[PDB]
Amino acid sequence: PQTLLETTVMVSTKMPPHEPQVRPLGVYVRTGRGGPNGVTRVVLVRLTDPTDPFFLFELELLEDDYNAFKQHLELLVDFHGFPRYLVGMLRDIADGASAYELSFVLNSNRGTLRVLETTDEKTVEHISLVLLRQGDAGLKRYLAERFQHYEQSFRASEASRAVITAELQEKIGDLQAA
Amino acid sequence: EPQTLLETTVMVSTKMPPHEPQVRPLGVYVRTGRGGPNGVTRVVLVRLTDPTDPFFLFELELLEDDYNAFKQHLELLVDFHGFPRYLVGMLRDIADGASAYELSFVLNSSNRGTLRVLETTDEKTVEHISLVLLRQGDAGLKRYLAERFQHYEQSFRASEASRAVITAELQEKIGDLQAA
């Protein structure tokens, strides 16, 4: 299970409680294994909001439903190659040097994420993904994991800070005696 | 002012039906603030958590308006104002290790549990306080998990920020003392 992309990206969002607006969102793309028996290859696309921890949308693209998916979007790429394609596009948008935009529009418990090139005449669509809002179960899991992760990271930070403070304090303490 | 009187981990004798009777570390958290049906009644929150299980969350929201009944039932001789001071002092003593009192948390069987501070003499197990904590629902749990997540992320950032500062501040002090 490898994580191909974790970053924050600026996104044109239509959400009914709010107004149409351009917000930063977290996009996460992890390839792994899953499905009804944990045997089918999978690509996860997860959309999150750094300002709202209860905002969580995911698409679990099962390899067995990829043919239909490939055809509907008229892609010319393996299941193997698809995330590479998607991530490259997102990364370009994230890294700021790109002509493409991201749109996330609600429609509720489903939302569509689109990579769009905007020319003079037309808004050209390069990909469209339907992400499902996650239920309490999956959200709790997400929140838990994040919490555990950042706590763990916070500990590690302090641990290695104490190490370094001491390592250099001894190098200050030896330059002082000499 | 919503003030946090105690956040610490304390060793606790626990009866929980999925597990065996055992002495685990648990997180006790005592925050005084304001709340209730209209957000106007003074409140004391006691929260019990498990560092090993993020889905374990038990809380008592002691409303000042139901404290008289509470005070009588436990036969306390303390204000609502003084009560948490009392409770926290006891817990802190137990946490500090310099204490004759123990903590007991026992579940039912599964959404209520009782937390007791107990002094064990030769003849009797004397009870100094008993609190009933309610397991919290997905709503309150998600809120908890969210807050913790945000907090530790925020803290993790701050740690790194001030680490980079210090590494540089001392590396410059290593970089200057060697040449001089």
Residue numbers in the entry:
A (entry chain A): 131 to 237, 244 to 314
B (entry chain B): 130 to 238, 244 to 314
Give sentences copied directly from the paper behind this entry:
SAS-6 organizes the rotationally ninefold symmetric cartwheel, an early assembly intermediate of centrioles that participates in establishing their symmetry and diameter. The cartwheel is organized through the homo-oligomerization of the highly conserved centriolar protein SAS-6. High-resolution crystal structures of zebrafish and C. reinhardtii SAS-6 fragments together with biochemical and biophysical characterizations demonstrated that two dimerization interfaces in SAS-6 mediate this oligomerization: a coiled-coil domain that forms a rod-like parallel dimer; and a globular N-terminal domain that forms a curved head-to-head dimer. SAS-6 is a highly conserved protein that is found in all eukaryotes that have cilia/flagella during some of their life-cycle stages.
However, by introducing the F257E mutation to strongly weaken head-to-head dimerization we managed to crystallize construct Lm SAS-697–320 F257E that contained the N-terminal head domain and the first seven heptad-repeats of the coiled-coil domain. We subsequently solved its X-ray structure to a resolution of 2.9 Å. The asymmetric unit of the crystal contained four molecules that were highly similar to each other and superposed with an rmsd of 1.17 ± 0.50 Å in secondary structure matching with 165 ± 16 selected pairs. The crystal structure revealed that the L. major SAS-6 coiled-coil domain is a parallel dimer and packs via conserved interactions against the N-terminal head-domains as seen in other SAS-6 homologues. The F257E mutation abolishes head-to-head dimerization in solution, yet, in the crystal, due to the high protein and precipitant concentrations, some of the SAS-6 molecules present are found nevertheless in head-to-head dimers and form a curved octamer. In this octamer residues Y215 are also swung into their own hydrophobic pockets, while E257 point away from them. These data suggest that the closed Y215 conformation corresponds to a low-affinity dimerization state of the head domains and might therefore constitute a potential regulatory mechanism of SAS-6 oligomerization. The presence of curved SAS-6 octamers in the crystal of the Lm SAS-697–320 F257E mutant that is strongly impaired in its ability to form head-to-head dimers suggests that wild-type versions of SAS-6 would adopt even larger assemblies.
